[PDB]
């Protein structure tokens, strides 16, 4: 438990000083803290805050103060005490698994592995989150795309057989294409809604395509009609029946990134966690696959220097080749392995029958009311898996971290693009704009707005990341962690951001979707 | 108990096709994949193919990729066995066997079913 | 394609004596081998799983060994019922393949 009020006054006493407004404030907090012991885990949380504040203004005030020492190993003892408070008191979790599929038509492998997870969940509730109003953000953004390819290849027709006009030339010049294009569905999408306001996206879009680039209608609307019955049969939610999502203010969010960057899966990023927050549950992309039975293959010891992700990736590609839960699965890892030890796991799975055995079930987990677990892997957190109880502290932080991060883009992207100049206008004044409002503190965070207009239409652009990505988890475990909100700088390393760690046993994350779908984006072609 | 029961002897021309049923019971039909072996007298045993339940993932021998066509009806717990350009050496025993895995561990085999192809 | 080279082609044997079946593969295979017995008139019955693991409701006399290309099937003590055709299938390469078998004949 954390240190008491006169233990604290034992820790700091000065002989020979007075005791100070802010000092005595401190011992004032704490000693009501501990009167609160049947108060709510956040309200707990909510006086270990003010604590800190407290001892924050102090050693503020009195730079020189003995008091110091003992009040900074003082502000250790409080996130002791967060974490204890978390690891201590739990709730149940809302058994709900919660995927996101919008702006086009569910996919046949989404689907499958879906089933996976309902297969050893027969008690969790499935949401397959979809847009009924956007089915053809997908096909309108191929179709733009692919006209803006064919306009760029028509210039430079003369020198593409030849070198001189590498892959970084063409995106360049395809992209002030896709923008003009991109900008013009806008205004139209803009000058539609005030002057119709009874239409929805899907409605705009498949007259917008029937004018500029000859798309019938007929076979978009039954594109539509096929679009929704594929995922009303496989545990369908539509988004705009979920009122607390949609009257919040991060719902602009989510159109903004849907509607105009044709940014799916940022937009996925803000639907996800408002979701978890006000239902609560598990969030998994649809290319995650249930835990491994953790005894399975514990008697196959792994080599020495490969990676974690090659095991895991041999354990479910070996699951797929002998049990074909998922036909068609790779084999490209467990074709690296010995004769014999192939023989090993063909042997367990060939004692195994059912598949109760190969995975395990969820079954009956409990969280803090102030965290959000998140999945981990080589390179850190990821938002692909989150568990979190319905309305956590983590999870408003979470949304306020997003809801802040767009703040400071659009104040710096709006005034550029009221202005009709072309792309290389907008980006110039749009980067102008981010070192002039950058301070020495969030640096990072602008460096990589820059490149947001290009998101979705260049290689390796990594911007989501940092708007509604995993970057703003870590932030807001930060502001958890040092009692604050608004963070921009992390200062968290591994250790601290394993408190939130999503057990392994409770997610299968090397799957062949997810390691196809990754980025891999040496992929210069120049087409045919 | 456990059980493959196939269909009857059959008797067909050069030519024609043949389908060969194996109905199983006693079992989670949805846990075991079936499996399918050719056995021409005083040959060795010949793996034609194997199916799946809950799906109609197929995988056939490569002398068989073309000759034989492995289908199911899950509702009733039984696999079907079509050939088709039936030749004269075609003239075997046709057995139907169950597996835990993809790769064929026959661990309970029907009593087989012998297909009889002359002019 | 993994060719199985089963050998002796025929083994004849007394009651009582010891039957050592050997099965060749072309190239490794693990230990992913299975051997099936067959009586004639009936189907092929599985003695032993992944070249030495056992199989219930086999008898303890029969058991097998192997590893990579060789693989032995051994029966310690032969019983009247024993003699009949032995098989030997590998699991681990597609196509999977037999053996050609071997005859196991009382001597007399």
């Known amino acids: 438990s954390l240190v008491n009020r006169k233990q604290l006054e034992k820790m700091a006493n000065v002989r020979f000083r007075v005791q100070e407004d802010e000092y005595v404030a401190i011992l004032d907090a704490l000693e009501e803290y501990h009167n609160m012991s049947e108060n709510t885990v956040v309200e707990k949380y909510l006086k270990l805050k003010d604590i800190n504040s407290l001892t924050d203004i102090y050693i503020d005030t009195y730079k020189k103060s003995g008091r110091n020492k003992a009040l900074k190993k003082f502000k250790e003892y409080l996130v002791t005490e967060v974490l204890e408070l978390k690891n201590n008191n739990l709730t149940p979790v809302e058994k709900n698994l919660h995927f996101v599929w919008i702006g086009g038509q569910i996919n046949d492998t989404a689907i499958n592995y879906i089933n996976q997870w309902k297969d050893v969940n027969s008690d969790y509730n499935v949401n397959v989150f979809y847009d009924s109003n956007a089915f053809l953000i997908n096909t309108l953004k191929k179709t733009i795309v692919e006209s803006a390819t064919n306009d760029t290849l028509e210039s430079f027709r003369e020198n593409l057989n030849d070198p001189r006009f590498d892959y970084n030339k063409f995106y360049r010049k395809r992209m002030e294409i896709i923008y003009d294009k991109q900008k013009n569905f806008i205004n139209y999408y803009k000058t539609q809604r005030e002057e119709n306001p009874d239409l929805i996206i899907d409605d705009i879009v498949k007259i917008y395509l029937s004018n500029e680039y000859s798309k019938d209608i007929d076979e978009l609307n039954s594109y539509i009609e096929e679009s929704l019955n594929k995922v009303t049969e496989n545990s369908g939610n539509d988004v705009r029946n979920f009122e607390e999502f949609k009257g919040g203010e991060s719902f602009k969010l989510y159109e903004q990134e849907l509607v105009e960057r044709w940014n799916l899966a940022a937009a996925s990023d803000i639907l996800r966690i408002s979701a978890l927050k006000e239902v609560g549950g598990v969030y998994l992309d649809v290319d995650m696959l249930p835990g491994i039975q953790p005894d399975l293959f514990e008697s196959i010891e792994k080599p020495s220097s490969v990676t974690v992700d090659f095991w895991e990736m041999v354990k479910l590609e070996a699951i797929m080749k002998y049990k074909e839960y998922i036909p068609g699965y790779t084999s490209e890892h467990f074709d690296m392995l010995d004769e014999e030890v192939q023989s090993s796991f063909e042997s367990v799975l060939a004692s195994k029958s059912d598949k109760s055995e190969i995975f395990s079930s969820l079954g009956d987990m409990e969280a803090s009311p102030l965290e959000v677990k998140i999945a981990f892997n080589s390179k850190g957190i990821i938002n692909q898996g989150l568990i979190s109880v319905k309305d956590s502290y983590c999870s408003n932080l979470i949304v306020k971290q997003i809801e802040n991060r767009y703040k400071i883009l659009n104040n710096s992207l709006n005034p550029a693009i009221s202005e009709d100049n072309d792309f290389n206008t907008t980006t110039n004044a749009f980067i102008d704009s981010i070192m002039a409002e950058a301070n020495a503190d969030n640096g990072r965070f602008m460096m990589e707005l820059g490149k947001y207009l290009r998101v979705g239409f260049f290689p390796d652009v990594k911007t989501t990341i940092n708007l509604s990505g995993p970057e703003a988890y870590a932030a807001a475990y930060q502001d958890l962690l040092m009692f604050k909100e608004g963070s921009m700088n992390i200062h968290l390393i591994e250790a601290d951001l394993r408190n939130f760690e999503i057990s392994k046993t409770n997610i299968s994350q090397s799957t062949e979707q997810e390691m196809a779908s990754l980025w891999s984006f040496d992929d210069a072609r120049a087409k045919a | 108990q456990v059980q493959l029961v196939q269909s009857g002897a059959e008797v067909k021309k050069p030519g024609a096709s043949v389908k060969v049923s194996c109905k199983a019971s006693?079992?989670?039909?949805?846990?075991?994949?079936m499996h399918w072996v050719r056995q021409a007298p005083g040959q060795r045993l010949e793996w034609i193919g194997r199916?799946?339940?809950?799906?109609?993932?197929?995988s056939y021998s490569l002398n068989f990729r073309d000759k034989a066509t492995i289908t199911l009806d899950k509702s009733a717990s039984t696999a079907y066995m079509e050939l088709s350009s039936l030749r004269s050496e075609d003239t075997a025993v046709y057995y139907c066997?169950?597996?835990?895995?993809?790769?064929?561990?026959?661990?309970?085999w029907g009593q087989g079913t012998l297909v009889t192809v002359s002019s | 394609e993994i060719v199985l080279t089963q050998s002796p082609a025929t083994l004849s044997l007394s009651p009582g004596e010891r039957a050592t079946l050997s099965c060749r593969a072309s190239?490794?295979?693990?230990?992913?081998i299975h051997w099936y017995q067959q009586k004639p008139g009936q189907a092929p019955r599985l003695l032993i799983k992944?070249?030495?693991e056992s199989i219930s409701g086999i008898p303890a006399r029969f058991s097998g060994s192997g590893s990579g290309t060789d693989f032995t099937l051994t029966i310690s003590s032969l019983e009247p019922e024993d003699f009949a055709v032995y098989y030997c299938?590998?699991?681990?390469?597609?196509?999977?393949?037999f053996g050609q078998g071997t005859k196991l004949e009382i001597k007399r």
């Open positions: 066997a169950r597996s835990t895995i993809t790769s064929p561990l026959l661990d309970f």
């Open positions: 006693g079992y989670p039909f949805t846990n075991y994949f």
């Open positions: 199916i799946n339940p809950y799906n109609g993932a197929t």
């Open positions: 190239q490794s295979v693990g230990t992913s």
């Open positions: 992944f070249a030495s």
């Open positions: 299938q590998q699991s681990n390469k597609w196509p999977f393949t």
